[PDB]
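Cross-posting from the chemistry board since nobody answered there.

I work mostly on the small-molecule side, so proteins are not my area. We synthesized zinc ion and want a rough idea of how it might sit in this target. Sequence and SMILES are below. Is it possible to get a predicted 3D structure of the two together?
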Amino acid sequence: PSNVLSMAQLRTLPLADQIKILMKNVKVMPFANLMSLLGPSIDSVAVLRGIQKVAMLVQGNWVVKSDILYPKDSGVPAEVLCRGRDFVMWKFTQSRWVVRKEVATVTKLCAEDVKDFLEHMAVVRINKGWEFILPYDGEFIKKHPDVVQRQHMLWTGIQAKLEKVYNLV
Ligand SMILES: [Zn+2]
Ligand SMILES: [Zn+2]
Ligand SMILES: [Zn+2]
Ligand SMILES: [Zn+2]
């Protein structure tokens, strides 16, 4: 609506708010673009810290965390939606391409929710499934090996949770 903050208004807020607000609006973002938006005043060590609080690494790009889109209060409990979306996001760490029917079969969620999860980080491609919306960011990955390894361990934790509640493979 009309209640959107301009970038100059955004840049007067605490750094944690800027990153949260940007990522919730723009759900997928390359790190270098986030740095550009926040402006030349900010240091990247603080942004590397801040982005991991609110987003996960996917294909070298940053994707806003599910609990930001679906906070604990939508008649479906927020944790059920978070789990479904986290599954989709997990699938995209494995591959740029995701088959909608596999998401429906595994999450057993409503077709509207499955579409909601996919369409805000991917677009359907004719006869090939849903393709993650940003290209693989090989440059961020090359330049931040420590963060990439950490994020891969965090995904290890998330996948273990998903394997407990869902029936993967
Ligand atoms: Zn989550
Ligand atoms: Zn619903
Ligand atoms: Zn939308
Ligand atoms: Zn990985």
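Reply from a structural biologist on the board:
Welcome over. Reading the output above for you: The longest helix spans residues 145-165. The chain is about 60% helix and 10% strand. Happy to explain the token format if needed.
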